[PDB]
């Protein structure tokens, strides 16, 4: 759950770091203010993105041997399907009884 | 021409080309990078 958001934020930060490095290079090579701080921030963000990528790659490696988490609660799915079918059949029978009663009265 | 010379060889402005070319290439690369 949180690892997905972490990887998404890491990718967004890598993109932002690339953009900041490009902008800092442009501002520094245009003419010769904040170019030094911009380059420092860009280098720091690039290093942080690299560290985050290395940490995510150095994960616990849950299985890496076969198809893990086999069985997605299919029994519960089938039970819920049968319950819904029972409810639908009950509704149909109740509607039939109601039509019979309306024809009676 | 160089291989032929390797036949008979013989010996016979504030433009600031590099200064302007550096900034020109910097802007050209920065444009594509920002894009």
From Swiss-Prot, chain A:
GO terms for biological process: positive regulation of transcription elongation by RNA polymerase II; positive regulation of transcription initiation by RNA polymerase II; protein ubiquitination; RNA polymerase II preinitiation complex assembly. Pfam families: Med11 (PF10280). Keywords: Acetylation, Activator, Nucleus, Transcription, Transcription regulation. InterPro entries: Mediator_Med11. Expressed in cochlea. One of its GO terms (cellular component) is nucleoplasm. GO terms for molecular function: transcription coregulator activity; ubiquitin protein ligase activity. The keyword Nucleus applies. Its main location: nucleus. Component of the Mediator complex, which is composed of MED1, MED4, MED6, MED7, MED8, MED9, MED10, MED11, MED12, MED13, MED13L, MED14, MED15, MED16, MED17, MED18, MED19, MED20, MED21, MED22, MED23, MED24, MED25, MED26, MED27, MED29, MED30, MED31, CCNC, CDK8 and CDC2L6/CDK11. The MED12, MED13, CCNC and CDK8 subunits form a distinct module termed the CDK8 module. Mediator containing the CDK8 module is less active than Mediator lacking this module in supporting transcriptional activation. Belongs to the Mediator complex subunit 11 family. Component of the Mediator complex, a coactivator involved in the regulated transcription of nearly all RNA polymerase II-dependent genes. Mediator functions as a bridge to convey information from gene-specific regulatory proteins to the basal RNA polymerase II transcription machinery. Mediator is recruited to promoters by direct interactions with regulatory proteins and serves as a scaffold for the assembly of a functional pre-initiation complex with RNA polymerase II and the general transcription factors. This is Mediator of RNA polymerase II transcription subunit 11. It comes from Mus musculus (Mouse).
UniProtKB/Swiss-Prot annotation, chain B:
Transmembrane segments: none annotated. It is found in: Nucleus. It comes from the Eukaryota. Component of the Mediator complex, a coactivator involved in the regulated transcription of nearly all RNA polymerase II-dependent genes. Mediator functions as a bridge to convey information from gene-specific regulatory proteins to the basal RNA polymerase II transcription machinery. Mediator is recruited to promoters by direct interactions with regulatory proteins and serves as a scaffold for the assembly of a functional preinitiation complex with RNA polymerase II and the general transcription factors. Component of the Mediator complex, which is composed of MED1, MED4, MED6, MED7, MED8, MED9, MED10, MED11, MED12, MED13, MED13L, MED14, MED15, MED16, MED17, MED18, MED19, MED20, MED21, MED22, MED23, MED24, MED25, MED26, MED27, MED29, MED30, MED31, CCNC, CDK8 and CDC2L6/CDK11. The MED12, MED13, CCNC and CDK8 subunits form a distinct module termed the CDK8 module. Mediator containing the CDK8 module is less active than Mediator lacking this module in supporting transcriptional activation. Belongs to the Mediator complex subunit 17 family. This is Mediator of RNA polymerase II transcription subunit 17. The chain holds residues 113 to 160 of 649 of the full protein.
């Amino acid at each position: 759950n949180e690892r997905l958001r972490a990887l998404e934020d890491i990718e967004r930060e890598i993109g932002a770091i690339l953009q900041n490095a490009g902008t800092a290079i442009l501002e520094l090579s245009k003419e010769k203010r904040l170019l030094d701080r911009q380059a420092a921030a860009f280098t720091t963000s690039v290093q942080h993105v690299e560290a985050e990528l290395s940490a995510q790659i150095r994960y616990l490696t849950q299985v890496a041997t076969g198809q893990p988490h086999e069985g997605s609660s299919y029994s519960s799915r089938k039970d819920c399907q049968m319950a819904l079918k029972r409810v639908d059949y009950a509704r149909l029978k109740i509607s039939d009884v109601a039509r019979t009663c309306e024809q009676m009265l | 021409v160089l291989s032929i010379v390797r036949k008979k060889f013989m010996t016979l402005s504030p433009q600031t080309l590099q200064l302007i070319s550096k900034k020109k290439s910097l802007a050209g690369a920065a444009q594509i990078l920002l894009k």
